[PDB]
Every structure is written in structure tokens, then in C-alpha cells.
Amino acid sequence: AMSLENVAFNVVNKGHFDGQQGEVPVSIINNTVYTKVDGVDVELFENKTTLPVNVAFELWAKRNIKPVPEVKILNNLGVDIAANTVIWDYKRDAPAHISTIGVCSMTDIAKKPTETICAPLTVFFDGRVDGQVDLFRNARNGVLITEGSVKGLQPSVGPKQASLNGVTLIGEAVKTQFNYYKKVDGVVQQLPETYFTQSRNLQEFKPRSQMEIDFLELAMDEFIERYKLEGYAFEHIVYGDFSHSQLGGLHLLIGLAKRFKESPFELEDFIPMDSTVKNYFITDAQTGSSKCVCSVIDLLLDDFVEIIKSQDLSVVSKVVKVTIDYTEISFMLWCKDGHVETFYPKLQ
Amino acid sequence: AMSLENVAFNVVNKGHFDGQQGEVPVSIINNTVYTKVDGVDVELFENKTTLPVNVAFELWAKRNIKPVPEVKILNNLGVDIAANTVIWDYKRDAPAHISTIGVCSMTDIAKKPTETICAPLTVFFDGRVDGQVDLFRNARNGVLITEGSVKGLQPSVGPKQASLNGVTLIGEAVKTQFNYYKKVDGVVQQLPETYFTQSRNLQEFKPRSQMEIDFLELAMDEFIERYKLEGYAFEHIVYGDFSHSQLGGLHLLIGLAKRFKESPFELEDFIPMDSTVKNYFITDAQTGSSKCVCSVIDLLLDDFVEIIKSQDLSVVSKVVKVTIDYTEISFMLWCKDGHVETFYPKLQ
Amino acid sequence: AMSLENVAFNVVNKGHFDGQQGEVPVSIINNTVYTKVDGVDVELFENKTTLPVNVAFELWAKRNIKPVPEVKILNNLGVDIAANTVIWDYKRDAPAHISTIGVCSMTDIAKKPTETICAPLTVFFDGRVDGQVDLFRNARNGVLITEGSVKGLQPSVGPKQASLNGVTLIGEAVKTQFNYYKKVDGVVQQLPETYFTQSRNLQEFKPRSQMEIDFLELAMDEFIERYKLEGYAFEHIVYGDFSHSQLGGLHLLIGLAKRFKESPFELEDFIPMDSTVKNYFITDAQTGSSKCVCSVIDLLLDDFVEIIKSQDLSVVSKVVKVTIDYTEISFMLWCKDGHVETFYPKLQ
Amino acid sequence: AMSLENVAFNVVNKGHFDGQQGEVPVSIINNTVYTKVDGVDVELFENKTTLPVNVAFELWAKRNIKPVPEVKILNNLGVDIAANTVIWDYKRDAPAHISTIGVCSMTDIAKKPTETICAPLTVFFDGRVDGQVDLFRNARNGVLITEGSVKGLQPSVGPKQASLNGVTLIGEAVKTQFNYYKKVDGVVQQLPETYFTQSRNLQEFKPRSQMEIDFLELAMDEFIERYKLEGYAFEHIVYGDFSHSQLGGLHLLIGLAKRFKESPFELEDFIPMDSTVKNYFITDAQTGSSKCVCSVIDLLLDDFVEIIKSQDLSVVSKVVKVTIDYTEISFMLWCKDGHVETFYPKLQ
Amino acid sequence: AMSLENVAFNVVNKGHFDGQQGEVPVSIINNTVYTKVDGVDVELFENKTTLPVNVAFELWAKRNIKPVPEVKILNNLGVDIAANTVIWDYKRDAPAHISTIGVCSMTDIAKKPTETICAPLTVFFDGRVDGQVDLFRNARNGVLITEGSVKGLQPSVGPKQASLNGVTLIGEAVKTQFNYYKKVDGVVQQLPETYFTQSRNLQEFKPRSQMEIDFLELAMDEFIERYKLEGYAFEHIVYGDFSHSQLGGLHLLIGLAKRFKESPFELEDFIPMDSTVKNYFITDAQTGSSKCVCSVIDLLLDDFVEIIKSQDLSVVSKVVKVTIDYTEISFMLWCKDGHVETFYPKLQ
Ligand SMILES: Cn1nc2c(cc1=O)CNCC2
Ligand SMILES: Cn1nc2c(cc1=O)CNCC2
Ligand SMILES: Cn1nc2c(cc1=O)CNCC2
Ligand SMILES: Cn1nc2c(cc1=O)CNCC2
Ligand SMILES: Cn1nc2c(cc1=O)CNCC2
């Protein structure tokens, strides 16, 4: 007995949809949902999606409020739809997926992931919900997350961090590190060995190793001497070159964080969505050095050092493929006389 | 001789409506009011209200620019409408009241509060405006604020703070502490003895007593020992419990401010309006501890200590009613073996 | 072969329009442009202009990404249109000019600035683009910027700072100080001797002289004694008077920056656009001192001292005209007994 | 190399999308597409769909301009999608289907109906397009229309009429009567014996038999005597009873057409879509007789007489199922003492 | 002292803008202007233009309510702007021109047509307004209409019909036939010999000659015999060929009017604007004969006969240029063995 007024009642009284009975007066004007409180209209939701306002309001109310995989992981694993939940994309302020299963009558393609319409779609299953591990076993295509072992299913240990109501975090009171499983055409797929992006912010950047503490504290030349990085072009790739009109390198988030402490800069997120590699139009405020497309990845500095130190430096230019967040990331490696000139996540 | 172009002229030249003569070219497109400056359109106002764009623009231009009672106080006193002014609600970016008296032809129910349509409504009167004290005396229902004594009318000393153009402050150059009076059905009502909320922000929180300085500076155990708060569950209620998936307690703003200095958190204001008790969907970023409905009140720590220390702790569960901002706030008091387990502003 | 899908392709792949071939699927809903990525819609642009959404999207994509004069300089020089580029106004999130020349078929009045429709308009020319110095020579009306000398054309050295993708900066890796030239009715005009505004922010304010370091570090009385400013009303004009309900003086940005370090305040930008003199409705949060129209100018303190010390202080009230950013700024000078009472950028 | 500007160029020059090269300037404002002609904006399309304005404009431009089956026939046959065409629904001013195959990049689920995504969907194939008969033979699910015989496949003769640019007609210069074929899970179905609705208008109603000429020309009693319809309640069912507050019967379009010649009436199409049975809220203007839900079907009078004369009239109330337009239509048959009381297309 | 409220007051009381003092309460919601009457909102104007709603409302209120030249005549004469009036385009529900002179502060480029901004624009002058004949004499570019002779200037007799509040008519109580004059670069032009379109409707078509009475009354073969039109393909061009899937000919409005009496048809006006030649996507309802682009012109049958009988019929295909409504209309003339095959207004 789903309704707009019942969804709004749950939002007002429970902070989100919680299956409670009740109705509150609602008014819809343009792309905003309001409710009357003390005689005046109070905004409950502003539709930033391409779905109708009342439909997006119901999907947002029915969002998953447990720690869930970050949308970039779900996209890299080919997830098309979620089973009986909504994975809300807080970077886009929209549902991560077009359709639903057992959530909302307007967006539902099926009520259960067992319907034949779900067979060709990669359905997201959550082992924390009763019967979802078994639904994954019977699904033709799907991705499963669990907190423990599944009998006979070989696990892939995912990232330490998960998204809880839009906050990316490594859980202390809740579990955020899941076992990951994937099935393509009825066959459980071996997830590849992968690095993970650290999902940090530029404003609240914190080092997660002794090498990252030394990058942020030590000067460029003493850091490169301490970690034996001579000939690996860290001056260009990680630190960044701000001497010319075109900004050189600056592809690691830690390098942007070190620069951010000294001088500010504009990072234009021209495709605003969660992704393993992010592209920004950067403008350095101190120098005026800029780059239209500056690919940035948040790898742990130790992981980036391991990647670049494991490459053959005897070829002028080559594509280096590295698995990060379960996806193959192509990097462009440019060398000269046995030393690195540049290394960057290749712009497609 | 009111007009859209005249309202816009006053906004451009005087910063708000100031009864001046003149007109500027205006363009309305969707919910925004623009004016032509140097050949280009410059935004003057974005309608975030449920009123028509030109009507909301005129009410915002005609907003009260003197320190006025915060909307939560006006709502707790049952204020329906203001006399010949607009109380702008800066938390909702909308007028605090549906209708006006002597302000705008589109929203006016009357030109003077003496019209019979105003008799059943609780009209807000401001003693700082000539003839408004007398209009309150003749009103059937109303709320009056004054800077001094009114002959024969027993005053209620309101909060130290008032809102001046959306800034809540305790006035030094202006008076913000008013005498409050209320009339229901022609009869002046005795306003109850009340506590006041402190109206502080989490980002700019400042202690307003020696006990509040000690809460923020001292460790949990030495503070509870110094102020003899053993057995009053301050560890749960004020400090907050972040060890389980459900966030425990955290109902006093000062407790959130102390936590905010160490680790950040998301506070989702799902009913965004000014109220004595606020409800937030909180997510602790450090631990992942969360609570869908976490009621928070900004009381002075000394006032909260006085409330909890004045309760009988011999009953398992009971409703404790405390007058705060002239309204009765129900608190849920849970005890065991003569000690507090929890105390929180009861979720309705 | 211009198209919406081609503009969006360039934005997605190049960060802006870069003349590349290709098309991406686009969806327009209301005032927002989206593109499909991984099956979901991702916002590329939100129209904040009065132009149609697809037209504004194309003008924003075709924005000048080289350091350009700040819109206030272009407006003060009478610039109506740009030659074969779009000067994007980042303070208004809109094009600085109504029409274009050789940019977009919907906004174009001409394809080349040589068309007779451009003769009466003051066209902006950029000497950094091939053939634009010659187009200025043949234009009836225009403004030219160059990085070096133009044979026979007497230059005017502009401000040190320029806007690069909305970031105002003094270039280190790029040139931001241009030579300025102007022509009215076929005749090259002598640009007047002028002061320049410093274009600083209140949050990131940095002193640019020893006098500005002393203003921010020294107490009011020792600063006024050190720089011999007794009788020049700096206590009122620069420091500001917060003792009465009406805020006194506070017309220099450096004075607001000094106050901002101690106590916060609301600055309501009621005409949000780039201008030499800005008008704000200010509310001091500490005292409650407020002013509906507080004119603020960001001059270097040394420049403001030179202006006020070069005035005759023997008249009660007079208009003082000072050239700032190539425009004549009227100031109101009020004196008594040979001393300054107030000096402010005159409210029109 | 599809684009908004190219789609508009085709609309302007060819009256619809015709694969021609070219671009015209376009402006999108709200839900309307305009083009500049002689300096002014001219409306090309108003979006009445739930799709984004530019997407709906492209689907409308790419509509099928050949006589196609009426949407009610396609829906009754379970058609989900069309192969490389858009069946435009002129009753809804929207595409008849959610997705496309080889039409528009925004709505396409596949470029060819041979893609595995199309296998479970009932794809509409048109034998008039080269290779579509063979695509139907290889499709798992589909509906095929042809103008002549298909080797091996036994045909179902469809209705005489088809929709050509929203005009339902029986072709004289073009063929509108198609052979219909259908496959479910790779098996060619035996389409059932079916009646067809005549798809006539109330304003331009024309009789299509000698019995229909006699219904419109003769008086009620002489018509019922001539065709031996005594005891079949035609006075109620077809002619209509306007003597009570509730309008009696009036379920055949021919009966409404006969009434329309004498007196007018309001027919409120509360679910505006193409369907075998239509429901209207009818108000007779002459008498004031009204009915909230008056089901109307346009059957040939001879076909309706054959249906009612082939029923058992010995039961008080029963559901009578009739295959009309290939779908099962339920009728409610009410009898008393061997005579009809009422017979109507069941409201369910 | 122009205002939204004053424009609305005039609309309500005078039926249009009439320079009366007064103000009525107005509400703007989306693209509609409302006024409060007896407590409820009543729609005054729905914006169908690309201008802001309040600007379009004011231009519509300030529309010319005297018989004015039809927009197609003004466009063909190169009219850019009107002098101190608004020519409302009722076919587009929008102003015929982008800018105004002395009408509305938002659209005005000048207050008088004597301003230098108006010199290069072809300004429309109306001799019925005092001083406009003299303003035309002093204008560099312009078009003048008069009811009588102008000393020294030789006139061009325009069409009999004019538009009065959107009704095209030949005046009986008012004069609608104007003398036309035109100046280009200060020189009075010699307007060319021109035919005029008759501007008739299909639903209210009336013959305006004995030949037109005979076309509508006589049969095809006796009409062609009476007016000696054998070999001129009137069977195809004027009568229309409905025997094939592609509708043949049907380019004269009189031919469509004759067909309309017998059978109905859909005329899709895909570029809805006033033009000498109109293009329609036609669908004949009786036969199903259709044509995507069917150019239609409303010439007097005698004028069309004179044009086709004055052509050389010895070439297979050629462009025939005819001055109609002062513009050059291209026709395509196809011949074979000395006889016409087709003649149509060229689609270009
Ligand atoms: C943690 N980790 N991940 C990977 C590899 C080595 C490693 O230590 C090798 N490249 C792909 C993924
Ligand atoms: C300041 N203050 N206010 C109140 C009470 C005691 C007190 O000291 C008693 N509870 C209600 C209100
Ligand atoms: C740098 N500078 N500019 C000006 C003046 C003196 C000066 O030193 C005189 N007033 C107008 C402009
Ligand atoms: C007795 N009787 N009852 C009904 C109907 C016809 C009738 O004769 C038709 N609608 C449902 C109820
Ligand atoms: C032979 N022939 N060709 C054409 C036309 C008439 C004709 O007779 C008219 N449209 C263009 C092509």
C-alpha cells in the first residue's frame, strides 16, 4: 500500500523509508517535495535526477542505509541493478542504477531477482539480507557481497572502505570490508588480483603509511633520495610541474594534497561521478599553470611506487595495464635512456 | 503604487525595500528575478518558496531588517501572522508565515491587524513600531515583543539572542533581548517559566559558562568527577556511544561540538526548519556508528545538568516535561537501580 | 558542423570545446544537460543564464581558457562583445556579453568582427590570437589586449592580475598583465592614469605591501601613529565603527579582512556581479551593527592612503573623482575643522 | 553522425527525419524546441512525453510515416518494441514503446533486432522493409505485418484500417490491411478468430453496412422491428437511456453518433490512450443524464448483433468473453425472463 | 512609470495597454501571468515566446490593435524593427521583431527611431501615427505604410488585406490597403511589380473572382475546357492527384479548399510562421495519399493562370522566379513535349 504521503511520513518520522504506516500532507512544486509543518511548507527533497520528482523521492527514501560498496566498485564489476534495495549515488545525488527490483512500482522491472527479466542483468546481492546468497547462486548474472565465507565460493577481499549514507569510511563499529563474488552467464568468475583506490578528499587528506607521512613532511629531493626514486620522474608525475602554461604531471591525489597545503587550486570535475580514475580541469592559483584534462588517481603511495618500479623502462612509449578496483586501468609509460619521463592514467 | 519594478529598484539601490520611488527593468525566468546591468542579466533573487516568484521576491524585499525573535520562538508561541512586516525564515529561505497584513497585495488578508479576519489569528506585534503595543491591547489573539515595560502588562524575559538578517546573535550595538507577551481569546496569558536554547552552530561553537569550558577541555572521566555527574549517564547522553552500529545518545549540541573537533560526521537535517529540538540522521565518519533519528537540543550544559539532577531516578521509564523556548518538551527518562540509563528529547 | 552532441563530446573528452570530432548521447531536462555514462545520466552543465540551456552550454564549452581581463575591467572599458571567443563571467555563471561573433549560430550577430553590424559595438580583441591586432586597427570601436608593444599604438599597462578559468591571479607560468588599447569612433583613445583594485577575497586575504602587513598586525592606534594618519578618520573609514545600530564606515576590503579574523559577519551581495566598487548589506555577528548599503573597494592600503592624503580638507562636503580600473569612481568627502569625518565610494 | 541540429534541419527541410546532411540553429526552452527563422524563434516541437525534450523530438522526427498498425492492435498483440522504426502514438503524443532498436542513441537498447537483448522482447517487424521478414523468422519473439503471402507461414487477416501520420484510414492509394504473424519463444502462433473495432470518430462517423445505414436513418422502433432485435435491450445498450440521472447503456459508438446528430454531449477521455474499449465520463447536454464510466466500443453494428444473438440468455449475470482486436474483451451480460437487460464491455 | 502591475491593470480594464494609471495584484507561475479576482487567480497571459514571461506579457499588451501589414509582407520587405509599436505575430504567438523602439525598457534598443542605433535597421513606420511619415523621410533604412499620397514619393499599392488583432481581412469599416514605401541607405527604392497572396483559410475559403467561383462549382474537366487550360497540368498542380501513395501536386490553396468540401485531410504545419509559401505534411484521409513537404501558396486562381500561361514550356526543368508579396519566389517548372508536367513553389 505504497504512496507519496506514506513515503513522506516515513521520511519525517523515521529519517528515511522504514515500512511504517501513516501519511503526511505533501505538495510537489516543480522538482521539490514539501510537507506542511506549523502551517508552512518545509522542503523534504530536491530532485537532482532525470526521474520524475515523486519517483526519485521514493527511491531516495528507500536508499540503503547500511555500509555499501562505493558506486565506482559496483560500476567496475558491471552491476546493472540492485536486488530489493536502492544504492544511492551521493556524488550524482541520484540512484546508482536506472531500474529497481521490489522497490518502487514506477521503476520496478520485477518484484524478485528470480524473474526472467533479471537473468541477463548483473544483479547486486547483499549476503547481509536473508536469502540473498541463495538468490546469487540461482542468478545467471550477479555480484555478491558478504561479511564471511560462502560454502564453496572462492572470495575476493574487497576494499577496507565502504559508503555509509554518502560517507566513505573504514568501519570500526560496522563492517565495511566485504567478500566479493561475481557471476557471468551462470558461471562464477574469478575476480582478478587488484589494487584499491583509497577514496580520500583533498581537504581532509590523511597519510595511511610511513612513506605517505614522509611524502607530506619531507622536501621533494630528500623524499626521492630516501625511497630511492631517482629516475622515476616523481618530480613530474607526483609532485607536479607548475613552471609552464601547461601543468605537468600531478596524477596522484597525495601530490595534489601536498600542493593544496601551500597554495590553492581549482579542480573542475567536468564528469561528476564516482570513478577509479578522475579527470579534472585544473588551474593552479599561485602560478596560473593549467591542464584541461588532468587524470588523478588516489592510490596509496607505496602501491604507486610498486607499480612504477615493476615496469620495464627500456621502451619509448607503451601501455601499462594495472588492475585497480577490479578494473583494468591503462597507463601511458614514456621512457628515455632507461629513466621515466612520464607515467599517467591514459586518457581514452 | 507597488510594483515588481519598484521592488527591484529598492533592492538594487537600498539593499531591500525602503519605500523609495523608482523602477528598474526586470526579467522573470522560471523562479529567478533578474535585472539588466551593463547589458547583461544579474540575478536579484532565487525563489526557494512555494509562493509565485514575484510574490516571494516582494516578501523577501519587505523582510524585517531589525533583530527579530527566532522563528522557533514565534512558532512555540503560536504566531500565525505578523503585523505590517515579514519575518523571513532564513533556515527555509521563505516567509515564516503564509499570509501578510499590510505588506503585499497578493498575500494580504487585511491591511491593518484591526480587521475582523485577524481576530482569530495570533498576530505578531513589535513594540518598537509606533502604535503596535496598542494594537496588541486591542487584538483578540497576539504575541508582543518590547524593549521595555508596558504599563500593567506582566513581562516574560525572552532569550538574550535574536535573528538580525539571518544572523543569530546577542546584541551589543542593538537590543536582542525582548519582553514577551501573549494573548489568547482577548485574555493576556501568563507565559511559563522557561529555559532557552542557545542557538549555536557546530562549526562555530563557543562555551558560555565555566562548566562548558571544562566539558570541551577536560577528558570525559575527569569532567564527570569534577561536576559530580556519576550515575547520570553523561557518557551515553552527552558524550555519545560510538562503539555499536547504532549511535548511542548524543542529544546535546555541546557533545556533538566536542566530537566534531576530533572526528567529522554527517548530520542530515531531514526536516530543515528552525526548532527547539532538531532531528538529524547522523553518521560518524570515524567509526561508522549511525542513527536515523538523533534528537539534538542546544541547552547550556549547566541547564541540562540542572534538569537531569532534578528528576526522580526510581522509575524504569517516564515522560519528563521541560519548558524550553516557551514550549513543553517531552523527554524520555530511563533508569535502573537509582541511576540514569538514558535521557532524550522524546521522538513523537 | 556544430551540434549539441559534438559540444558534449568535447566537454566529456577535452574538458571544454576543442574543435574535436565526435558525438555523445545527450539529454536535456529543464535547465540541465546530461550525458549517459555506464547506463546513468551524469550532469555536464546547469544553466544559470537567461539564454536557452543548449545555447548557454555551448557558450560555456567555448569559454576562453587563457588568462583574460576580469569582467569589471571589460565593463569599465565599455566592452559590448568579444571577437571569436566567449568571456565567461564566473561571478554570474553566465557569458559576460549578450551576443557573440564567430562562436555559436544562436548568439552570433556576425561571423567576423569586420561585418558592419560590429562597427558601432566595442569589440574585445586579443593580440595573442593571430590577426586580432589588425582587426582592432580596422574596427570602428574596440578594446585590445596584448602581451607586448604594437607599432605606433601607445599602451596602457593594465592590472597585474587576470582571470584564468574563474581564478583571479597574478601569473608566474603565464602572462596576466596586458597592454590595453581602446578605440571610440575610429579614434584610438588615450586611456587615463588609473589605480587598480587588488581583487582579493575576504577568506584568503594576503597583504601586498609593508603598510598592509602593519595594518593587519598592529593595533589601530599604533598603526595610525606609525603612518601619520591622525585626522584622516581611518578609525571610521577603514577599521569600521561597530558601536551603533548603523555600522560606520568599513569601505576598504583590508578593514573587513582584519575584522574577519576576530569576528564573523554576513556580507549580502545583493547585485552579484564583478565591479570596481561592490555594495553589500553587512551584518556584524558580534555586535549586531548593520548597514543596508556598505560600499567596499579593494584598493592597496598605500593607494587608498595616497588618495585621501591628496585631498583638500577645507570643505564640508564634496565629490572626489578617482580613476580606478579605468573608470571614474566618485567618493564623498566629508570634513570638519581641517580633519576627515568620512570618505566613501558614493552610492548612486 | 546524429545531432539535435541535424534532426531539426531534417524537420525544417523534409517535414520529418530523412537522413539528410545539414544543421539549423536550435534553442531548447523548457519542453519546446525552436529554430531561428528570419531572426525570430519558430516552434518545431512541444514535448508532451515523459522523455527529455531533445530525445522525444528525435523520436517524433524519426516516426514511421507509412500506414502502420494502430497502437491498440500492437498492444493487444504484446508488442514491446519496434525494429528500426518509431511507432508514434498520436493519441498520447508520445512514442508507443519505451525503447528503440537502431533509431536514437539515447533510447536504443540495440542497433539490430538480432542482438540477444531483443530475443525475449516481442519485436515489431514490417515486411515492407527489406530483410524484416527474415529477421522475424530468426527472432525468438515478434509480430510481423506483410502486404502479401509469406512462404510456409499461415496468415491472419488484420483490420482494413491502419494509422498514417495519426489519421486512421482504409487505404485507397496505399495498402492498410496487413497479414499478421506472431511468434512466442521461437514458435509461430496460431492467431485467434477475432472481431475488429472500426476506429471511427463521433464527428465524422460513416456507416459501413446496410444495417448501419438503417440504424442512423430509421427510428428506434422500426429499426428493432426490421432486424428482429426485440428482447435484446438495444433501446438501453445502443440507443441509450437519457430519462434518469444515470445515463443508461450507450456502449456502441454508432449509438453515440446517432445521438450526436440531434444533441451534443461531453465525453471525458480520463485515460487518453488507444484501446479496444474506451472509457468516458459522459454528460448529455440536453437532459443532464450522466455516467462516470461509460465503456464504449466501436464495433460494426452487424458484428455486435452477431455477438449478442450468440449468447445464452437464461442466466441473471455472467461474463462473456469476445476476441476483439486479438485481445480478450470481457462483457457483462445481464438477463431476466429470457431477455437481455444490459450487455456492456466489463469495467475491471 | 511602467510596471508589471500597471500593464496587468490595463489588460484587465482596457483589454490591452492603454496608458492608464492603476495596479492590480499579479502572480507569475512558470510562463503564465495571473491576477486575483474575487479571491481566486485568473489567467491573463500564457507565454508562448522565448522572451521572459513578464517581458512577453508587456509586449503583447502593447501590441498594435489597428489593421497592420501581415508579418509575411514585413519580413519580405526586410523589416527589422517597428517604430514605437509592437507588431504581434499571431501565427507564432510572439512579437514579430526581436527588439523595440519606445515600447518596453527590457526590449528597447532606443526610445526614438532617430537614434543612431536605428539608422542601419529597416524601421517600420506607420503614416497613420503623427510624425511617422517625417521620421521615414529622415531614416536611413525603413518601410512606410500610408492610407493616402505622400508628396514627392511614388507609392506601391500593397495588398487589399491587413491583420487586425490576428484576423486577416479586407476592411469595410477600416482601411487595410496601404501605400508602401521603402528606403535603403537613405535612397527611396522603386518597389517591384508584385503579385499578392490572398491569405485565405481552408475552413472559410471564399472565391474572389468569376474563375474562382467556376473552379469551386464546376467539375475538373469542364473547368479546364472553359478556361482553355489543356496541357497546363491543372489536374495535377491545382486539383491534386490522390491515386498514388505520394500525393501529387496540390500547391494552390483553392485546390485544397475544393478537396476539403468533399473529404478531410491533415495539414501538418511543421514550421508554424507567416510566409508567402507554406509547407505542410499532408495526409488525405479518404485515400491515404500523403506528401512530407507539400508547398502551398494562396494565389488568386486568375493570377496563377497568368503566371503559368506566361512561361516557356520547351525545357525539361527550370527555375521560374515570381515576385509575390514583394519577395522573389522560385518555382520549379517541369515540362515534356510542350506541355506542363508540374509547377510548384521550389523547396530550397
Ligand atoms: C596488492 N597488489 N595488487 C596487484 C598486484 C600486486 C600487489 O601487491 C599486481 N598488479 C595487479 C594487482
Ligand atoms: C531558568 N530556569 N527555567 C525553568 C526551571 C528552572 C530554572 O532555573 C524549571 N523548569 C522549567 C523552566
Ligand atoms: C598609480 N597612480 N594612479 C593614479 C594617480 C596617482 C598614482 O600614483 C592619480 N589619480 C588617478 C590614478
Ligand atoms: C440488476 N442489475 N444489476 C447491475 C447491472 C444491471 C442490472 O440489471 C449493471 N451493473 C452492475 C449491477
Ligand atoms: C521527371 N520529373 N522529376 C521530378 C519532378 C517532376 C517530374 O516530372 C518533381 N520533383 C523533382 C523530380
UniProtKB/Swiss-Prot annotation, chains A, B, C, D, E:
Q: What name does the UniProt record give this protein?
A: Uridylate-specific endoribonuclease nsp15
Q: Where is the NendoU domain?
A: 206-345
Q: Which residues form the AV-Nsp11N/CoV-Nsp15M domain?
A: 64-189
Q: Which residues take part in binding uracil?
A: K291, C292, V293, C294, S295, T342, F343, Y344, P345, K346
The UniProt-reported impact of T114I is: In strain: Omicron/BA.2, Omicron/BA.2.12.1, Omicron/BA.2.75, Omicron/BA.4, Omicron/BA.5, Omicron/BQ.1.1, Omicron/XBB.1.5, Omicron/EG.5.1
Provide the site residues for: Transition state stabilizer: K291
Q: What does this protein do?
A: Plays a role in viral transcription/replication and prevents the simultaneous activation of host cell dsRNA sensors, such as MDA5/IFIH1, OAS, and PKR. Acts by degrading the 5'-polyuridines generated during replication of the poly(A) region of viral genomic and subgenomic RNAs. Catalyzes a two-step reaction in which a 2'3'-cyclic phosphate (2'3'-cP) is first generated by 2'-O transesterification, which is then hydrolyzed to a 3'-phosphate (3'-P). If not degraded, poly(U) RNA would hybridize with poly(A) RNA tails and activate host dsRNA sensors.
The places in or outside the cell where this protein is found are: Host cytoplasm, Host perinuclear region
**Signal sequence residues:** none
Give start-end ranges for the coiled-coil region(s): none
Whom does it interact with, and what assembly results? Homohexamer.
Task: List, from the UniProt record, the residues annotated as the active site of this protein.
Answer: H236, H251, K291
Q: What is the effect of changing H236A?
A: Complete loss of NSP15 endonuclease activity
The cofactor note from the UniProt entry for this protein is: Likely affects Nsp15 binding to RNA.
Domain Nsp15 N-terminal oligomerization as annotated: residue spans: 3-63
**Cofactor section:** Mn(2+)
* Entire protein: shown range: 6453 to 6798 of 7096
Which reactions appear under catalytic activity for this entry? uridylyl-uridylyl-ribonucleotide-RNA = a 3'-end uridylyl-2',3'-cyclophospho-uridine-RNA + a 5'-end dephospho-ribonucleoside-RNA
| Site note Uracil recognition site, residues | S295
